[PDB]
């Protein structure tokens, strides 16, 4: 798994560039990141469908969700044809930050990972079972550039619960393209 760290006040200076898979959460969750991996335990093959994939791990975040009974669950993750998919991840790319955490786990495809906390920014991009949890009043966005068909679980929220912006500034449309 790649990590791709950058400073503010420039970008096209890394003030951390490393691949490690260990040293990766210790970074991250270092700054209170959540990290972790689940697998299956079943053999699986010709997958055409998530819906049961999910099933297989739904067990897992069947804990997550009964504490946090969020509104509704579902996940993210339409066919390439869809042309309004780079429309729908612009809306997402302006930054804002939620009352509560934003948990996102990865089933299948691979994205990019953005998360700013303080003065410096943190760029992930490797697709592993493992996930990533935001914490409620972090500053963060989200961008697919590229999306061949990804497989990831989302949460259902309102916008009242999240604000938009807090500066109005939008740093986020910097890194919005992927590979
Ligand atoms: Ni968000």
């Given at each position: 798994s790649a990590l791709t760290i950058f400073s503010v006040k420039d970008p096209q200076n890394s003030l951390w560039h490393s691949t490690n898979a260990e040293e990766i959460q210790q970074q991250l969750n270092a700054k209170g990141v959540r990290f972790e991996r689940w697998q299956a335990d079943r053999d699986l093959g010709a997958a055409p469908t998530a819906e049961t994939v999910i099933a297989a791990y739904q067990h897992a975040i069947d804990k997550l969700v009964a504490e946090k009974g969020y509104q509704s669950w579902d996940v993210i993750s339409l066919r390439?044809?869809?042309?309004?998919k780079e429309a729908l991840r612009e809306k997402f790319l302006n930054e804002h930050t939620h009352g509560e955490d934003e948990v996102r786990f990865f089933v299948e495809g691979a994205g990019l990972f953005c998360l700013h906390i303080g003065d410096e920014v943190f760029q992930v991009l490797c697709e592993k079972n493992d996930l990533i949890s935001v914490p409620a009043h972090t500053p963060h966005w989200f961008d697919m550039g590229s999306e061949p068909n990804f497989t990831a679980i989302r949460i259902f929220d309102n916008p009242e619960g999240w604000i938009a912006q807090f500066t109005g500034d939008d740093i986020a449309s910097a890194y919005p393209r992927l590979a």
């Open positions: 390439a044809d869809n042309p309004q």
